[PDB]
């Protein structure tokens, strides 16, 4: 069944699951040709595969060479995504393989279902949620590793930094989705909020600044203000 | 020309013989059907006046024996049986034919409808889908479910059609996932035609049998099978040219013969719009497309 507000808490139970987002797999700049036609040039992308309970992020970098000489790239991207996700499952020890995989876009259901035929006990689910995972390329260290890659590469991150030492995975996921939603609705302002204070740094082994509990409350507040506003600035309210 | 004689008609019933049908009143002096064309399978089917629930009927070929119908008042249906005494049967049919107590299979000479709907249907294949080996004829009814249906409950009463499942290992070669899911030619030509059906005639035979069970009995799994076999061909980029041409003729007559007031349930919108307008073979079914557009433009 689909994942929605009603069954939100299932994400943080003890059944291994993964979110799969394919939004940033196939990325193009569109440009004009000398003849005045339009062409696309691909840039590196990534598959965003996340354990919402542990914060473990399997960032599969999609090097532009994988598109070379291929047709219908938007459709291939979904299949490529499905192949990498299934290769990932297969590489994990049995006790680490997900019992569920949740795709953020329904067009991934059939490609993933076909690639996972060897795993009939892994439920492939869509969601009704409008999750902001596309904004993961707004996270500087993730964007940096993607853009610098010269070959296919898998990079492993904990998208929650050390937060699970102090908060539950429900709150960590809620923080993450709040940050990513802010970065998606107004990336400049979201980044201004995260770095306004020169004294709060990002540890070399982290993605997000080292905020105290009190500072995270202020920060989270500032991100909610931004999201409400930009909704206003958009809808004039 | 052969004969399906009846012992009597004790309950009011609409009797169907192939694509024809006629009403028999309770205890009317009706003793059966004569002049049945040799060389084709046939189906004789029933819908009781009292309980329109359960259309049921018998597939049979008169070359395979002498068959008659007798109402069973315990099981409450018209049962087909084989008269194993050739003399008793010839005499009885003659007696009936003399008293003119039989309706004539009402075939117009210009009319090739039945041949065209049963071109590739063979009684021997029917008997492997409908497993009841002690009889030469095969019972079907509205409620029988398919093997594939039961997988997703009484095995002896199933329709053992060939299982087609687009999201299965059988359909999908490891390492050809996208290729095989978007272009089913592998699954059609190697797995099914060469592997399971052996030739296109056996494939078309089952397809035509599925349709006929769907139309005559409203059998839902039969309709599912019909559409699946159509969709496997239409979604294959590589089909022998002879199969496409024959498919267009096949489907044309199925659509021509469908009762107009049953198209809403028997025809799957998704399959037909995909097949006629999106699929590899979108251009290869000119007759079927033209009849479908002039007769059911709503569905599309
Ligand atoms: N009379 C019998 O016992 C067999 N019944 C029968 C009736 C019609 C035609 C052929 C046979």
DSSP string, chain B: -EEEEBS---S-EEEEETTEEEEE-TT----EEEEEPTTS-EEEEEEESS--S--EEEEE-GGG--EEEEEETTTTEEEEEE---HHHHHHHHHHHHHTT-SEEP---TT--HHHHHHTT--HHHHHHHS--TT-SSEEEETT--BHHHHH---GGG-B-PPP--TTSTTTS-TT-HHHHHH-THHIIIIIIIIIIISSHHHHHHHHHHHHHHHHHH--HHHHHHHHHHHHHHHT-S---HHHHHHHHHHHHHHHHHS-GGGHHHHS-HHHHHHHHHTSTTTTS-HHHHHHHHHH-TTT-
For chains A and B, count residue pairs whose Cβ atoms are closer than 8 Å: 22
What does the alpha-carbon distance between residue A188 and residue A184 come to, in Å, rounded to a whole number?
10
B28, exposed or middle or buried, with CB in 10 Å at 0-12, 13-18, 19+?
Answer: middle
How many other CB atoms sit within 10 Å of the CB of residue B139?
A: 16
Q: Are residues A132 and A177 in the same domain?
A: no
Rounded to a whole number of angstroms, the distance from the CA of A21 to the nearest CA of chain B is 19
Interface touch A117/B181, C-beta < 8 Å: no
Residues of chain A with C-beta less than 8 angstroms from the C-beta of B168: 117
Which of A163, A198, A220 is the last residue in one of the domains? A163
Q: Are residues A65 and A91 in the same domain?
A: yes
Which of A137, A163, A189 is the last residue in one of the domains? A163
Reference A129, options A146, A145, A107, A105; nearest CA is: A105
B201-228 per-residue burial string, b: 16 or more CB within 10 A, e: under 16: ebbbbbbbbbbbbbbbbbbbbbbbbbbb
Read off the tokens for B257.
């013969």
Q: Which residues pair with A62 in a beta bridge?
A: A45
Q: Is residue A24 part of a domain?
A: yes
Q: Are residues A140 and A216 in the same domain?
A: no
**Obtained via which technique?**
X-ray
Give the residue on A whose Cα is nearest the Cα of B166.
Answer: A114
Q: Is residue A1 part of a domain?
A: no
What does the alpha-carbon distance between residue B14 and residue B22 come to, in Å, rounded to a whole number?
6
B7, exposed or middle or buried, with CB in 10 Å at 0-12, 13-18, 19+?
Answer: middle
Q: Is residue A2 part of a domain?
A: no
What does the alpha-carbon distance between residue B195 and residue B31 come to, in Å, rounded to a whole number?
46
Interface touch B167/A76, C-beta < 8 Å: no
Contacts of A73 (CB under 8 A, 6+ apart): A26, A42, A67
Read off the tokens for B225.
């099978």
Read off the tokens for B100.
């003119």
Q: Domain limits at B147?
A: 116-299
Read off the tokens for A146.
């993607």
Could you tell me the CATH number of the domain that includes residue B286?
1.25.40.550
Residue nearest to atom 6 of ligand 1 (CA): B7
Cα–ligand 1 centroid distance for B101 (angstroms):
14
Q: Which residues pair with A12 in a beta bridge?
A: none
B260-275 per-residue burial string, b: 16 or more CB within 10 A, e: under 16: eeeeeebbbeebbebb
Q: Are residues A80 and A142 in the same domain?
A: yes
Interface touch B177/A110, C-beta < 8 Å: no
Q: Are residues A176 and A141 in the same domain?
A: no
Residue nearest to atom 1 of ligand 1 (CA): B7
Q: Domain limits at A46?
A: 9-163
Q: Is residue A3 part of a domain?
A: no
Write out residues 125-164 of A within 8 Å (CB-CB) of B. Answer: none
Q: Are residues A224 and A149 in the same domain?
A: no
Residues of chain B with C-beta less than 8 angstroms from the C-beta of A110: 167, 181
Q: Resolution in A, one decimal?
A: 1.7
Which of A163, A195, A225 is the last residue in one of the domains? A163
Read off the tokens for A128.
């009704």
Q: Are residues A174 and A204 in the same domain?
A: yes
Rounded to a whole number of angstroms, the distance from the CA of A223 to the nearest CA of chain B is 41
Let me know: does B245 contact B287? Beta carbons within 8 Å.
no
Per the listing, tokens 């049995």 go with A94
Angle, alpha carbons A112-A114-A116 (nearest 5°): 65
Contacts of A32 (CB under 8 A, 6+ apart): A38, A39
Ligand 1 site, residue B207, Cβ cutoff 6 A: no
Per the listing, tokens 């009603």 go with A6
Q: Are residues A235 and A123 in the same domain?
A: no
Go through chain B and list every residue after which a break occurs, taking a C to next N gap over 2.5 angstroms, comma-separated.
152
Could you tell me the CATH number of the domain that includes residue A224?
1.20.80.40
Reference A163, options A219, A200, A212, A223; nearest CA is: A212
End-to-end CA gap in chain B:
42
Q: Are residues A220 and A199 in the same domain?
A: yes
Q: Are residues A133 and A204 in the same domain?
A: no
Let me know: does A10 contact A2? Beta carbons within 8 Å.
no
Q: Is residue A4 part of a domain?
A: no
Q: Is residue A233 part of a domain?
A: yes
Read off the tokens for B67.
């068959």
Q: Please state the three-class secondary structure of chain A as a single string.
A: CCECHHHHHHHHCCCCEEEEECCCCCEEEEEECCCCCEEEEEECEEEEEECCCCCEEEEEEECHHHHCCCCCHHHHHHHHHHHHHHHHHHHCCHHHCCCEEEECCHHHHHHHHHHCCCCCCCEEECECCCCCHHHHHHCHHHHHHHHHCCCCEEEEEECCCCHHHCCCHHHHHHHHHHHHHHHHHCHHHHHHHHHCCCCCCCCCCCCCCCCCHHHHHHHHHHHHHHHHHHHHHHHCC
Let me know: does B127 contact B114? Beta carbons within 8 Å.
no
Q: Is residue A205 part of a domain?
A: yes
How many other CB atoms sit within 10 Å of the CB of residue A221?
A: 11
Q: Are residues A73 and A124 in the same domain?
A: yes
Let me know: does B43 contact B58? Beta carbons within 8 Å.
yes
Let me know: does A108 contact A75? Beta carbons within 8 Å.
no
Could you tell me the CATH number of the domain that includes residue A69?
3.30.420.230
Cα–ligand 1 centroid distance for B32 (angstroms):
11
Give the residue on A whose Cα is nearest the Cα of B180.
Answer: A114
Contacts of A165 (CB under 8 A, 6+ apart): none
Read off the tokens for B261.
């007031």
Overall domain count for chain A = 2
In angstroms, how far apart are the furthest CA atoms of chain A?
58
What does the alpha-carbon distance between residue B18 and residue B212 come to, in Å, rounded to a whole number?
9
Residues of chain B with C-beta less than 8 angstroms from the C-beta of A82: 177
Best to test chain B binding among A78, A85, A86, A117 (most B CBs inside 10 Å): A117
Closest ligand 1 atom to residue B89 Cα is 10
Q: Are residues A83 and A197 in the same domain?
A: no
């Amino acid at each position: 069944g689909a994942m929605n507000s009603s069954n939100y808490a299932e994400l943080f139970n003890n059944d291994i699951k993964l979110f799969v987002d394919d939004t940033n797999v196939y990325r193009v700049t569109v440009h004009k040709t000398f003849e005045g036609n339009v062409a696309t040039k691909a840039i590196n992308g990534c598959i965003f595969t996340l354990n919402p309970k542990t914060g473990h992020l399997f960032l599969k970098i999609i090097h532009t060479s994988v598109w070379a000489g291929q047709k219908r790239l938007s459709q291939l991207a979904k299949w490529k995504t499905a192949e990498e996700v299934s290769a990932l499952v297969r590489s994990l020890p049995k006790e680490e393989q997900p019992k569920q995989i949740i795709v953020t876009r329904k067009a991934m259901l059939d490609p993933l279902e076909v690639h996972m035929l060897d795993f009939p006990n892994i439920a492939i689910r869509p969601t009704e949620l409008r999750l902001p995972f596309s904004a993961a390329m707004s996270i500087d260290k993730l964007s940096d590793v993607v853009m610098k890659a010269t070959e296919p590469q898998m990079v492993l991150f904990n998208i929650y930094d050390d937060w699970l030492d102090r908060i539950s995975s429900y709150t960590a996921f809620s923080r993450l989705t709040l940050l990513l939603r802010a970065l998606k609705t107004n990336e400049e302002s979201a980044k201004m909020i995260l770095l306004s204070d020169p004294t709060i740094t990002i540890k070399s082994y982290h993605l997000w600044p080292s905020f105290t509990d009190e500072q995270w409350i202020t920060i989270e507040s500032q991100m909610r203000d931004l999201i409400l506003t930009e909704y206003g600035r958009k809808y004039n309210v | 020309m052969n004969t399906v004689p009846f012992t009597s008609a004790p309950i009011e019933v609409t009797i169907g013989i192939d694509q024809y049908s006629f009403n028999v009143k309770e205890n009317q002096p009706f003793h059966g059907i004569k002049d049945i064309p040799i060389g084709h399978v046939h189906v004789i089917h029933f819908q009781h006046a009292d309980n329109s629930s359960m259309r049921y009927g018998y597939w049979f070929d008169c070359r395979m024996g002498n068959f008659y119908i007798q109402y069973d008042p315990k099981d409450g249906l018209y049962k087909m049986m084989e008269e194993r005494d050739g003399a008793k049967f010839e005499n009885i049919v003659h007696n009936f034919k003399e008293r003119q107590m039989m309706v004539s299979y009402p075939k117009i000479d210009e009319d090739d409808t039945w041949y065209n709907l049963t071109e590739f249907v063979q009684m021997d294949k029917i008997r492997k889908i409908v497993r009841k080996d002690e009889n030469q004829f095969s019972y079907v009814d509205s409620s029988m479910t398919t093997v594939q249906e039961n997988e997703l409950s009484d095995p002896a009463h199933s329709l053992n059609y060939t299982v087609i499942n687009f999201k299965s290992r059988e359909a999908i070669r490891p390492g050809h996932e996208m290729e095989d899911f978007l272009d089913k030619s592998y699954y059609l030509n190697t797995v099914m035609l060469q592997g399971i059906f052996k030739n296109s005639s056996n494939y078309f035979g089952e397809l035509q049998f599925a349709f006929l069970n769907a139309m005559f009995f409203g059998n839902y799994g039969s309709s599912l099978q019909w559409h699946a076999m159509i969709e496997l061909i239409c979604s294959s980029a590589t089909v022998p040219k002879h199969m496409l041409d024959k498919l267009d003729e096949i489907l044309y007559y199925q659509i021509k013969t469908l009762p107009e007031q049953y198209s809403d349930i028997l025809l799957n919108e998704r399959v037909w719009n995909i097949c006629l307008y999106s699929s590899f073979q979108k251009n290869s079914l000119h007759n079927t497309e033209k009849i479908m557009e002039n007769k059911y433009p709503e569905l599309l």
